[PDB]
Design a binder for this molecule. Sequence first.
Ligand code: Y01
Ligand code: Y01
Ligand code: WHJ
Ligand code: 2CV
Ligand code: 2CV
Ligand code: 2CV
Ligand code: NA
Length: 286
Amino acid sequence: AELLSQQWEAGMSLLMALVVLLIVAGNVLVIAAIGSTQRLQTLTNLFITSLACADLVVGLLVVPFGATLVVRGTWLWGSFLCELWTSLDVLCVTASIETLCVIAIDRYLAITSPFRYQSLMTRARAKVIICTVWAISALVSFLPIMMHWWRDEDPQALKCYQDPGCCDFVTNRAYAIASSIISFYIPLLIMIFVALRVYREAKEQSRVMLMREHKALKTLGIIMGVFTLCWLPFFLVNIVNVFNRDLVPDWLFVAFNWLGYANSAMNPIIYCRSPDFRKAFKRLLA
Ligand SMILES: CC(C)CCC[C@@H](C)[C@H]1CC[C@H]2[C@@H]3CC=C4C[C@@H](OC(=O)CCC(=O)O)CC[C@]4(C)[C@H]3CC[C@]12C
Ligand SMILES: CC(C)CCC[C@@H](C)[C@H]1CC[C@H]2[C@@H]3CC=C4C[C@@H](OC(=O)CCC(=O)O)CC[C@]4(C)[C@H]3CC[C@]12C
Ligand SMILES: COc1ccc(C[C@@H](C)NC[C@H](O)c2ccc(O)c3[nH]c(=O)ccc23)cc1
Ligand SMILES: CCCCCCCCCC(=O)N(CCO)C[C@@H](O)[C@@H](O)[C@@H](O)[C@@H](O)CO
Ligand SMILES: CCCCCCCCCC(=O)N(CCO)C[C@@H](O)[C@@H](O)[C@@H](O)[C@@H](O)CO
Ligand SMILES: CCCCCCCCCC(=O)N(CCO)C[C@@H](O)[C@@H](O)[C@@H](O)[C@@H](O)CO
Ligand code: NA
């Protein structure tokens, strides 16, 4: 009884710390590699930096707080931090998918109008783009949460809101559908639509330079496909819940949300497809 709990707590604390380490180390590396390698200070990599920041915030704040909930079996940190934690969670996934959209648009523009791209895309504008994404994402995530537009009137929902060790994020049906559409589905569609036009246009194309570019494009494609595989199961289940809470087992709904957090560890590994990133990682780790 108390032994079975001790074994589980200690083994889970350790797995959690591993995830935290991998997310934080991997994304600090990406940021430091870009922040100290001129060859890597392209405009596209400014968006990559932004994406690393969303992942870094998941590593430093989102996962650590989720970890304490899974390991200790209650929320230890009070009402405010529960709301803040929830806000940052929604914020990071919103920021990530909107950033992946920008990246897909960046590539579409550079490939179909390399001359308009040259005169339009500057560092100052890349900066404005990045901040606009974070602004919108802040908008979509903080306010509805701080204005309590997510709450429900249910017996189960009020059972959680007064209990100070509950932080389940039980929402009303309107918020579930609205946030899912606004924070995830709409940008997911834009990104797919644009990513395929990039596919077509890259395929409707010296040989060595073209092979090198198509390698980098494929890396971005993999970044986008893995993000989709990590979050689509959760958002598919979030919706299906609205209509029938019996269709999908709870343990699996929880699992899919963690698969979402997990995505934050995957991009630095995926960037090892690049010799330039690989060499900068080797140079930084000393
Ligand atoms: C606790 C939560 C709310 C986290 C808040 C994070 C944001 C404030 C971060 C995430 C991504 C960051 C951005 C990532 C990339 C850039 C590009 C960067 O462009 C540069 O001039 C530096 C690169 C160079 O040109 O050498 C300027 C900072 C900026 C806008 C950062 C500003 C701060 C941002 C928006
Ligand atoms: C709230 C959800 C449902 C909307 C998700 C849409 C976003 C993922 C993307 C789609 C196209 C993106 C926009 C495409 C182009 C621009 C112009 C861009 O660059 C500038 O405006 C700089 C120009 C300057 O100030 O000189 C600012 C960001 C913005 C609005 C982007 C912000 C994010 C947008 C709206
Ligand atoms: C299923 O078990 C868990 C595990 C962790 C958590 C923390 C909460 C804050 N997770 C939020 C989730 O990542 C999310 C992110 C972004 C969204 O737009 C979300 N919309 C929802 O309706 C419901 C959830 C939702 C909540 C429930
Ligand atoms: C949850 C995170 C939320 C991030 C919120 C982003 C805030 C909106 C963006 C913003 O504040 N700026 C646009 C940045 O693109 C201000 C900058 O323009 C500022 O640096 C200017 O004062 C100077 O450019 C002029 O000297
Ligand atoms: C970007 C996301 C923006 C979503 C904002 C949606 C807020 C809608 C308000 C809302 O739906 N409720 C009030 C919360 O302020 C809760 C009700 O759905 C529910 O509690 C009861 O009315 C039940 O009886 C079901 O009808
Ligand atoms: C309230 C009870 C909910 C408990 C849910 C906790 C699940 C543990 C989360 C976790 O750290 N992983 C499983 C994810 O759920 C491991 C991840 O690193 C995983 O994604 C990778 O191992 C694979 O992607 C590649 O091998
Ligand atoms: Na509570």
